[PDB]
Paper text:
We identify a horizontally transferred T6SS with Ntox15 family nuclease effector (Tde1) that mediates interbacterial antagonism among Bacteroidales, including several derived from a single human donor. Effectors with novel toxin 15 (Ntox15) DNAse domains, also known as toxin_43 domains, degrade recipient genomic DNA. Cognate immunity proteins are encoded adjacent to T6SS effectors and neutralize their activity to prevent intoxication of self and kin. Crystallographic snapshots of isolated Tde1, the Tde1/Tdi1 complex, and homologs from Phocaeicola vulgatus (Tde2/Tdi2) illustrate a conserved mechanism of immunity inserting into the central core of Tde, splitting the nuclease fold into two subdomains.
Tde1tox interaction with Tdi1 increases thermal stability (melting temperature 67°C versus 55.5°C). A Tde1tox/Tdi1 dissociation constant of 18 nM was measured by biolayer interferometry (BLI). We therefore obtained crystal structures of the Tde1 Ntox15 domain in complex with Tdi1, as well as a homologous complex from P. vulgatus dnLKV7, Tde2tox and Tdi2. The Tdetox/Tdi complex homologs exhibit very similar structure despite 51% sequence identity between the Ntox15 domains, indicating a conserved mode of effector–immunity interaction. When bound to immunity proteins, Tde1tox and Tde2tox split into two subdomains. There is an ~32 amino acid region disordered in the crystal structure, corresponding to β2, α6, and the surrounding loops in the Tde1tox only structure. Notably, this disordered region contains part of the HxxD active site motif and most of the DNA binding site. Superposition of the Tde1tox alone structure with the Tde1tox/Tdi1 complex indicates a conformational shift characterized by a hinge motion, as well as an ~180° relative rotation of the two Tde1tox subdomains. Upon immunity interaction, Tde effectors undergo a dramatic conformational shift, highlighted by superposition of the Tde1tox alone and Tde1tox/Tdi1 complex structures. The immunity protein does not sterically occlude the active site, but rather splits the effector into subdomains and structurally distorts the active site, which is disordered in the crystal structures.
Numbering used by the authors:
A (entry chain B): 2 to 194
B (entry chain A): 162 to 218, 222 to 270, 303 to 316, 329 to 343
The structure:
């Protein structure tokens, strides 16, 4: 993950991961994701745009909006400044994948299981940031708004699902967990992108 | 207008009750969301809602199976052209005539919306904060 470390502006690694903690995910996620945990830890990367989070702290809320077959497990590992969620899905029938859950628009997108390309290439590619993650307004929002801390995000008030307009005027720094919980209770099921 | 109560009420789910501070923050969120809605005209709330329904849309295993195959093909381009436009990559992947091409290509807010539509310059008037269900 030399590329990830070189291309992330103003990285802050807030903490390393306990090894005993991440090794209970041995059979749930890829070796690649585990290596990324050891490198990235808990932190804020790419000039504040992405955060690596404690998976079990996001486990319940992803199972709340991401429907799964009984042979699937989902492990959250990264979020956007908006509270969008990246998670690794273990799937024993068709093989693994990553799901990008856009909390603003109520969609999920099936991404490749390959964490190496996602994190060294995809999140630095401007058109993926725009077309996959709808993150293109970030540099514009971040000149007018402070940086959310790792337990905060740019929330829309009101939420876009709740009829809010998508503009910088409706953005507030809110605590991420009750926000995401409220947005999900406002929306039906996630829609496939 | 007439006061539209969110149906069903929001929940304070049991998993989040072990933390005594969560409910407080939830209530704060629900209140700030409610004021944000009530600050809108009915027209613009309906405008945004129908705009929102435009994003996103069978058997999920079959769709994910196809998407996995497609994503492996997309990955081959990303490895070679790190800064290439992903729409171009996707179009080239989706244009191949073999491989991928063998695989056939296959609500709390909505309730407020439906109650409002049968109610029909004028401001939205909803209540989100009452009747938080505990457990």
């Amino acid at each position: 993950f030399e590329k990830f470390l070189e291309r992330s502006g103003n990285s802050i690694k807030l903490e390393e991961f306990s090894e005993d903690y991440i090794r209970q995910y041995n059979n749930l996620v890829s070796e690649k994701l585990i290596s990324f945990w050891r490198i990235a830890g808990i932190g804020i990367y790419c000039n504040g745009l992405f955060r690596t989070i404690i998976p079990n702290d996001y486990q319940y809320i992803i199972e709340e909006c991401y429907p799964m077959y009984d042979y699937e497990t989902v492990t959250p590992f990264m979020i956007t400044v908006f509270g969008d969620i990246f998670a690794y899905v273990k799937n024993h029938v068709i093989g693994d994948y990553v799901v990008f859950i856009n909390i603003r628009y109520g969609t999920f997108k099936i991404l490749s299981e390959n964490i190496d390309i996602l994190l060294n290439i995809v999140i630095f590619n401007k058109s993926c940031l725009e077309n996959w993650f709808l993150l293109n307004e970030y540099n514009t929002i971040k000149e007018v708004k402070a940086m959310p801390k790792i337990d905060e995000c740019y929330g829309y008030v009101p939420a876009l699902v709740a009829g809010g307009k998508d503009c910088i005027d409706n953005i507030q720094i809110v605590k991420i967990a009750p926000y995401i919980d409220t947005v999900i209770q406002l929306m039906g099921d996630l829609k496939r992108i | 207008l007439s006061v539209i109560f969110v149906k069903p009420p929001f929940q304070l789910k049991k998993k989040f009750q072990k933390d005594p501070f969560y409910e407080i923050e939830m209530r704060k969120q629900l209140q700030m969301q409610q004021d944000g809605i009530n600050n809108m005209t009915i027209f613009e709330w309906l405008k945004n809602r129908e705009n929102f329904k435009k994003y996103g849309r069978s058997k999920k295993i079959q769709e994910d199976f196809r998407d996995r195959y497609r994503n492996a093909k997309i990955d081959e381009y990303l490895l070679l052209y790190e800064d290439m436009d992903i729409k171009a990559i996707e179009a080239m992947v989706d244009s191949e005539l073999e491989g991928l091409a063998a695989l056939a290509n296959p609500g709390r807010s909505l309730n407020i919306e439906n109650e409002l539509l049968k109610l029909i310059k004028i401001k939205m008037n909803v209540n989100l904060v009452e009747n938080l269900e505990i457990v």
